[PDB]
Amino acid sequence: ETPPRFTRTPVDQTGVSGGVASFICQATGDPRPKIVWNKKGKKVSNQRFEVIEFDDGSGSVLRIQPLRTPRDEAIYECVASNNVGEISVSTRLTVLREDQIPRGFPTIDMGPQLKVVERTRTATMLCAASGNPDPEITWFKDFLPVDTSGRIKQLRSESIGALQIEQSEESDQGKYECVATNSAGTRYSAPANLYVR
Numbered sequence: 001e002t003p004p005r006f007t008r009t010p011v012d013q014t015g016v017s018g019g020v021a022s023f024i025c026q027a028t029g030d031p032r033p034k035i036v037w038n039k040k041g042k043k044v045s046n047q048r049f050e051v052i053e054f055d056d057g058s059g060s061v062l063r064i065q066p067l068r069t070p071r072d073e074a075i076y077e078c079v080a081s082n083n084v085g086e087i088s089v090s091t092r093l094t095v096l097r098e099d100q101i102p103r104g105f106p107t108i109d110m111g112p113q114l115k116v117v118e119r120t121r122t123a124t125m126l127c128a129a130s131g132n133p134d135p136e137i138t139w140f141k142d143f144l145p146v147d148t149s150g151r152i153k154q155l156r157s158e159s160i161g162a163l164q165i166e167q168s169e170e171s172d173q174g175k176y177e178c179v180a181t182n183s184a185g186t187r188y189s190a191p192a193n194l195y196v197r
Contacts, residue, residue, distance in 0.1 A: 001030050001031065001082075001083075001084045002028075002029055002030050002084060003029060003082070003084045003085030003086075003087070004027045004028070004029035004033035004080035004081060004082055004084075004085060004086065004087050005027060005028055005029060005080075005087070006025070006026070006027050006078075006080065006087065006089060007026045007027060007028055007058065007059075008024055008025065008026040008059070009025065009078070009089045009091075010023035010024055010025050010062075010076070010078055010089070010090075010091035011023070011024075011091060012091055012092040012093070012094075013091070013092075013093050013094070013185075013186055014093075014094040014095070014096060014184065014185035014186060015064070015067045015093065015094070015095050015096070015185060015186055016067065016095070016096050016097075016098070016101055016105065016185065016187065017066075017067055017068065017069045017095055017096065017097050017098065018066045018067060019065070019066065019067050019186075019187060019188055020063065020064065020065040020066075020067065020177075020188040021063075021064045021065075021067055021072075021093055021095075021186065022061050022062070022063045022064075022140065022143070022145075022179075023037075023061065023062045023076060023078070023091055023093075024059070024060075024061050024145060025037070025059050025060060025061075025062075025078035025080070025089075026054065026058040026059030026060075027058070027059055027080035027087070028058070029080065029082050029084070029085075030082070030084075031082045031083060031084075032057050032082065033059075033080040033081055033082050034080070034081050034082065035059045035060050035078060035079070035080055036078075036079045036081070037049075037051060037060070037062045037076060037077070037078060037079075038076065038077040038079060039074050039075075039076055039077075040074055040075055040076075041077065044062065044076070048064060048065060048066060048068070048072075049062060049063070049064050050062070050063045050064075050065075050143070051063075052142075052143040052144060054144060059078075059080075061143060061144055061145070062076065062078075063143050064093070067095045068095065069095035069096065069097055069100075070095070071095075072093055072095050073093060073094055073095050074092075074093060075090050075091070075092055076090065076091055076092075076093060077089070077090045077091075078090075078091070094185075096185065101185075102184045102185075103132065104131045104132025104133065104182065104184050105131060105182075105184045105185050105187065106129055106130070106131035106135040106180035106181060106182055106184070106185065106186065106187040107129060107130050107131060107180070107187065108127065108128070108129050108178060108180060108187055108188075108189045109128035109129060109130055109159055110126070110127065110128035111127060111178055111189030111190050111192065112125045112126055112127055112176055112177075112178050112189055112191075112192035113126070113192050114192055114193050114194075114195075115192065115193075115194045115195070116194075116195045116196075116197050117165070117168040117172075117194065117195070117196055117197070118168070118196075118197055119168055119169055119170070119196050119197070120167050120168065120169070121167075121168055122164055122165065122166050122167075122168065123164070123165040123168045123172065123194055123196070124162050124163070124164050124165075125139070125162065125163040125165075125176050125178070125192060125194065126160065126161075126162055127139075127160070127161045127162070127163075127178030127180075127189060128159045128160055128161075129159060129161060129178065129180035129187070129189075130159045130180075131180065131182050131184065131187075132182070132184075133182045133183055133184075134182070135180040135181050135182040135187075136180070136181050136182070137154075137156060137161030137178060137179065137180055137181075138154075138178075138179045138181065139154065139163045139176060139177070139178060139179065140176070140177045140179060141174045141175065141176050141177075142174045142175050143175075146163065146176075148163075151165070151166050151167055152164070152165050152166070152172075153166070161178065163176065165194075168194075168196050169196060170196055172194060172196055173193075173194055173195055173196050174193070174194060175191045175192075175193055176191060176192050176193070176194055177189055177190075177191045177192075
């Protein structure tokens with residue numbers, strides 16, 4: 001038996017009012033750590049705050065949608081625990097008004113669109129995004145981050161970000177969101193469905 005240890009700690013988010021923010025927290029340990037999200041020390045307990053567990057039990061994502069300001073702006077804590085010990089770490093959510101959104105805050109110029117791929121063929125989800133600094137584009141599938149490092153690869157060029165899913169299969173079906181992030185903040189695309197025919 002071993003105490004909880006973090007494998008992925010949440011990273012500060014600046015979102016826009018009405019938009020989305022996600023925080024990721026994973027840990028290992030034996031027995032399997034329970035992950036609880038707190039807001040300034042109390043368990044999160046509001047309808048717009050949703051905890052989605054990774055299928056493998058490694059942890060969870062706290063997803064907040066729609067973001068409200070000033071209400072949601074706070075320090076949040078991820079607490080990992082089992083019968084041998086407990087650890088926590090915190091992260092910060094900032095939520096900007098339209099009135100407060102910087103010039104270079106990421107824009108989704110073109111979000112992903114509905115796709116149907118034949119099984120074993122490459123599916124490509126597309127996202128055009130811009131901002132200053134040039135934002136990083138990442139992908140969420142069914143509210144969880146798509147990690148890619150390789151059947152599933154992410155390609156990137158000027159404002160275009162692509163998620164290429166080689167040898168597509170049934171489990172790749174789902175709801176994909178493009179996420180654009182830079183030092184000014186994080187913007188989500190509307191989700192697009194992928195089907196595997």
